Structure 1
Amino acid sequence: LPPRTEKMAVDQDWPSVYPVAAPFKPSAVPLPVRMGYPVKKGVPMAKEGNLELLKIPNFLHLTPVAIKKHCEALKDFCTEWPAALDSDEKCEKHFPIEIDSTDYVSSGPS
């Protein structure tokens, strides 16, 4: 059976196809992308079976339309900086103490 990119309209809603971080699926991306060092008198490898395209941490789930749609939805969670504190001069006047603490984001079970 054929890949489902054949049914995809040219004016579709791409964020719905890749809602979250997923690996590269050549049957789901309607792009004729090629990757590989082209052979002597040849071409870069096609996408189907291409391990190089599957090793990329692609940003298909984060497109400008997707990012803008997400950030229009996430506005409900934000607050407003106190307008009085216009610059560092007033930040060091009204709130003299400064506490620095750091968080670390690695990848692993712990």
Structure 2
Amino acid sequence: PRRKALPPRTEKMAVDQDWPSVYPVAAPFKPSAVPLPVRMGYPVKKGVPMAKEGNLELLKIPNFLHLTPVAIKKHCEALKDFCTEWPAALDSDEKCEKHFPIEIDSTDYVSSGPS
């Protein structure tokens, strides 16, 4: 015979699951793993936007499914541990430049590529 594809696992997903476990990091939109009936595509006349499956328009979006509000709050809790506290004495900019007269500026440039 010819290997048949299993059904999408969105059906086995609980309407109350924790979504952050499904997409922990940035990953490309997978129709079989996202339980949303989302459609995209300029519709033909008397037609509907195209279904998620095989929809190359949805695969061209840089999606934010790995950064839901839930996920962010959870993430930032685990990261409060890493950050230290601003000197409460340095309330205003007046106080900043009283105690620290020099300011050093520098820029970092984030860009995609091998180098």
How far does the alpha carbon of each residue in 1:11-65 deviate from its partner, in whole angstroms, 9 at most, with x for none? Answer: 0010000000000000000000000001111100000000000000000000000
d(CA) in 2 for partners of 1:11 and 1:94? 52
Taking only the aligned residue pairs, the percentage that are identical comes to 100
Aligned residues: 110
- Structure 2 spans left out of the alignment, 5+ residues: 1-5
d(CA) in 2 for partners of 1:80 and 1:42? 56
d(CA) in 2 for partners of 1:83 and 1:40? 63
How far does the alpha carbon of each residue in 1:64-103 deviate from its partner, in whole angstroms, 9 at most, with x for none? Answer: 0000000011000010000000100010100000000110
Detail structure 1 runs of 4+ shifted over 2 Å in the superposition: none
Q: With structure 2 as the length reference, what TM-score do the two structures score?
A: 0.95
C-alpha RMSD of the superposition? 0.4
Q: Is 1:52 matched up with 2:90?
A: no
Q: With structure 1 as the length reference, what TM-score do the two structures score?
A: 0.99
